[PDB]
């Protein structure tokens, strides 16, 4: 391990970080949103999860046409979700339960609402016209409509500009029309980002930040027309001329120095970017220790799979090997550097783990609940676990498009219908993929109980503020769950037992191999850490599966599984569908 600077212990990397979705994870006021009360009164069961630390997104004030990720104001709390003394409350309580608390940092762009937007768009003169990216219309179109600066899309669909009709120019929004993007061109205009929105959490005792599309925060000059790579769309991804920008390292790194200057109590703090796309030496660049710009990225291969590299929602085949492919991109490229990784299949962003990589089929929901559970108990970095994973929930199913509430869903929707037509071959393939692919399948409220109808997220007569999964009525909820010992739930307390007691090479092992890459069932690897060795044998089928340990002896004791205990004979060399075994040798 002296060649693998990696394995230097802290914190931040054998900490599991759960994730909560605030306005779905517990409201305490029966007005159908979360709040941070809520959270408050479920830190128990996180910690009795196993989690050492919690990141929550959004509660910012906030107008919620991105649910929390246009934010109006850095300094103040959603007053639906609470109070800042509420929230300065709950950093204590998980504090106090010996959890970390990391903060959601939303820096590329803010809401039209925030007033340093309210103050740019104002007059083409104001002190604050160049914190954001104000350009005049290209020309007027044969319909007498202004025409965008550029041809780049949003991330949600249509244009990536909106017109003010009082200056008469266009900004740039990469997402939703009330998400300006901040110009980090302009210094004054960066400085006041970090006394907003990172020097006042920090003077408040965060951890921590995840840090949202950390690599979009450097466009190229001129923010030229991007390449026609997509023949079938009037606008084109802007990827080229955004995403790891020129600037993007010098800025970071002026953050970090930035953060590094204003802790005041020497505390270590961790930062995530969720940087999407980069390549190895782009990750290193971002992660190296020695660098000072962040501690560890999310990277979505993993999380893209089965999706067009062209948009979102048109399905694809995908085969498993892609699948481990893409996992691998999280950390192999941390192999003997002082970088780091995170290892996560949910979040706010994606649909259940079970139904895109396991079977969330009755029969099987279970079991390839737990065989996630077992894989990702076994990878190097820090593990994320987002709020209903650990209870193996799953997509919703047969829900009409009117039904989802996501402004991704809205607005791509209804690019596509102004595109190509409400009854379009490219209508019906987006109407496929959203049943697979939303946002909102890691959105709806957390299942608490079996109560009727709101399983216990909120009280009976509460209306929620988005509809929940029928999968509560199945037994996919808290209480159910706890008293079962063959549930989801029980089984993630058992992995993270396991993982923690392993951490050395779990958590912090070196040296990964695939063991048969190309498998379309089994998804096999070993690792090392000094003079041990980890050895994954994994059944991503429900058709039984052989497997092979290389260099197999006596020495290889089986670990960890989801299998009954009493029931698996750790000699055989077959897996039983679904099944999954972690083998240490010492
Ligand atoms: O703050 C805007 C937007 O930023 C982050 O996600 C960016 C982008 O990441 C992936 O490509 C997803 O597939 C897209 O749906 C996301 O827009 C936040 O994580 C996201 O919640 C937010 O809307
Ligand atoms: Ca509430």
């Given at each position: 391990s002296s060649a693998h600077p990696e394995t230097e212990p802290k914190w931040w990397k054998e900490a599991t970080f759960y994730q909560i979705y605030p306005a779905s994870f517990?409201?305490?006021?029966?007005?159908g949103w979360g709040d941070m009360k809520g959270i408050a009164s479920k830190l128990e069961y996180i910690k009795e999860l196993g989690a050492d630390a919690i990141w929550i997104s959004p509660f910012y004030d906030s107008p919620q046409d991105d649910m929390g990720y246009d934010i109006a104001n850095y300094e103040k709390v959603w007053p639906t979700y609470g109070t800042n003394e509420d929230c300065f409350a709950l950093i204590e309580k998980t504090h106090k339960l010996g959890m970390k608390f990391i903060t959601d940092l939303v820096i590329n762009h803010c809401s039209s609402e925030h007033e340093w937007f309210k103050e740019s768009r104002?007059?083409?003169?104001?002190?604050?016209?160049?914190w954001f990216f104000w350009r005049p219309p290209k020309g007027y179109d044969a319909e007498g409509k202004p025409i965008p600066p550029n041809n780049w899309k949003s991330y949600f669909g249509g244009s990536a500009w909106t017109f003010d009709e009082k200056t008469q120019e266009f900004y740039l929004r990469l997402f939703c029309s009330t998400q300006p993007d901040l110009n980090w061109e302009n210094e004054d205009c960066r400085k006041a980002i970090y006394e907003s929105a990172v020097g006042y959490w920090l003077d408040h005792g965060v951890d921590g930040f995840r840090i949202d599309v950390g690599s979009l925060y450097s466009k190229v000059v001129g923010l030229p027309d991007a390449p026609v790579?997509?023949?079938?769309?009037?606008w084109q991804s802007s990827d080229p001329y955004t995403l790891n920008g020129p600037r993007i390292h010098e800025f970071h790194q002026e953050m970090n120095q930035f953060i590094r200057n204003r802790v005041k109590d020497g505390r270590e703090i961790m930062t995530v970017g969720a940087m999407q796309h980069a390549s190895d030496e782009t990750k290193r660049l971002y992660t190296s220790a020695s660098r000072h710009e962040l501690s560890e990225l999310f990277n979505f291969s993993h999380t893209d799979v089965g999706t067009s590299p062209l948009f979102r929602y048109n399905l694809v085949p995908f085969e498993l090997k892609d699948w481990k492919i893409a996992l691998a991109e999280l950390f192999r490229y941390i192999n003997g550097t002082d970088c780091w990784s995170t290892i996560y299949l949910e979040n706010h962003d994606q649909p259940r783990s079970i139904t895109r990589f396991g079977d969330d089929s009755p029969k099987n929901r279970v079991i390839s609940g737990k065989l996630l559970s077992v894989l990702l108990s076994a990878l190097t970095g820090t593990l994320y676990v987002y709020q209903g994973q650990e209870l193996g929930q799953i997509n919703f199913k047969?829900?009409?498009?009117?039904?989802y509430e996501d402004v991704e869903i809205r607005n791509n929707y209804n690019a596509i219908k102004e595109e190509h037509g409400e009854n379009s071959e490219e209508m019906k393939k987006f109407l496929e993929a959203i049943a697979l692919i939303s946002r909102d399948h890691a959105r709806t409220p957390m299942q608490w109980s079996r109560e009727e109808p709101n399983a216990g997220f909120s009280g009976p007569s509460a209306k929620p503020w988005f509809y929940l999964n029928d999968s509560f009525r199945e037994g996919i909820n808290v209480e159910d769950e706890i008293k079962d010992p063959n549930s989801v739930l029980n089984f993630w307390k058992e992995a993270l037992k396991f993982r923690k007691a392993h951490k050395d090479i779990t958590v912090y092992g070196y040296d990964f191999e695939f063991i048969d890459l190309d498998n379309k069932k089994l998804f096999s690897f070993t690792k090392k850490y000094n003079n041990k060795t980890l050895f994954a044998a994994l059944n991503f089928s429900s058709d039984a599966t052989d497997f092979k340990i290389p260099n197999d002896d006596s020495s290889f004791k089986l670990e960890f599984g989801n299998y009954p205990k009493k029931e698996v004979d750790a000699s055989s060399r077959t897996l039983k569908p679904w099944e999954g075994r972690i083998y240490i040798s010492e």
């Amino acid at each position: 391990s002296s060649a693998h600077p990696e394995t230097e212990p802290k914190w931040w990397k054998e900490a599991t970080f759960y994730q909560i979705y605030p306005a779905s994870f517990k409201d305490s006021n029966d007005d159908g949103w979360g709040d941070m009360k809520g959270i408050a009164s479920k830190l128990e069961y996180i910690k009795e999860l196993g989690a050492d630390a919690i990141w929550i997104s959004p509660f910012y004030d906030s107008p919620q046409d991105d649910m929390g990720y246009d934010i109006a104001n850095y300094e103040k709390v959603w007053p639906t979700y609470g109070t800042n003394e509420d929230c300065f409350a709950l950093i204590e309580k998980t504090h106090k339960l010996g959890m970390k608390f990391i903060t959601d940092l939303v820096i590329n762009h803010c809401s039209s609402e925030h007033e340093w937007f309210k103050e740019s768009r104002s007059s083409k003169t104001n002190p604050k016209r160049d914190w954001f990216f104000w350009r005049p219309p290209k020309g007027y179109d044969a319909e007498g409509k202004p025409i965008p600066p550029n041809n780049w899309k949003s991330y949600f669909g249509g244009s990536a500009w909106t017109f003010d009709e009082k200056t008469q120019e266009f900004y740039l929004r990469l997402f939703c029309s009330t998400q300006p993007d901040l110009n980090w061109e302009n210094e004054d205009c960066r400085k006041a980002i970090y006394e907003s929105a990172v020097g006042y959490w920090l003077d408040h005792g965060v951890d921590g930040f995840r840090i949202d599309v950390g690599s979009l925060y450097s466009k190229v000059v001129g923010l030229p027309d991007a390449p026609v790579v997509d023949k079938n769309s009037t606008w084109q991804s802007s990827d080229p001329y955004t995403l790891n920008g020129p600037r993007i390292h010098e800025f970071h790194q002026e953050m970090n120095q930035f953060i590094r200057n204003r802790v005041k109590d020497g505390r270590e703090i961790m930062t995530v970017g969720a940087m999407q796309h980069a390549s190895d030496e782009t990750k290193r660049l971002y992660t190296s220790a020695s660098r000072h710009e962040l501690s560890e990225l999310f990277n979505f291969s993993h999380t893209d799979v089965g999706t067009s590299p062209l948009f979102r929602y048109n399905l694809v085949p995908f085969e498993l090997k892609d699948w481990k492919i893409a996992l691998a991109e999280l950390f192999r490229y941390i192999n003997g550097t002082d970088c780091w990784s995170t290892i996560y299949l949910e979040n706010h962003d994606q649909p259940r783990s079970i139904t895109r990589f396991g079977d969330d089929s009755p029969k099987n929901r279970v079991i390839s609940g737990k065989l996630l559970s077992v894989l990702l108990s076994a990878l190097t970095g820090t593990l994320y676990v987002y709020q209903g994973q650990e209870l193996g929930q799953i997509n919703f199913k047969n829900w009409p498009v009117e039904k989802y509430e996501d402004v991704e869903i809205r607005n791509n929707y209804n690019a596509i219908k102004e595109e190509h037509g409400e009854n379009s071959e490219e209508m019906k393939k987006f109407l496929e993929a959203i049943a697979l692919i939303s946002r909102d399948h890691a959105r709806t409220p957390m299942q608490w109980s079996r109560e009727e109808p709101n399983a216990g997220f909120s009280g009976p007569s509460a209306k929620p503020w988005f509809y929940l999964n029928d999968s509560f009525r199945e037994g996919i909820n808290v209480e159910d769950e706890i008293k079962d010992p063959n549930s989801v739930l029980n089984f993630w307390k058992e992995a993270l037992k396991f993982r923690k007691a392993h951490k050395d090479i779990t958590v912090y092992g070196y040296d990964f191999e695939f063991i048969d890459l190309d498998n379309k069932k089994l998804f096999s690897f070993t690792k090392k850490y000094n003079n041990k060795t980890l050895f994954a044998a994994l059944n991503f089928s429900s058709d039984a599966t052989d497997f092979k340990i290389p260099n197999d002896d006596s020495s290889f004791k089986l670990e960890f599984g989801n299998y009954p205990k009493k029931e698996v004979d750790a000699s055989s060399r077959t897996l039983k569908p679904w099944e999954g075994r972690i083998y240490i040798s010492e």
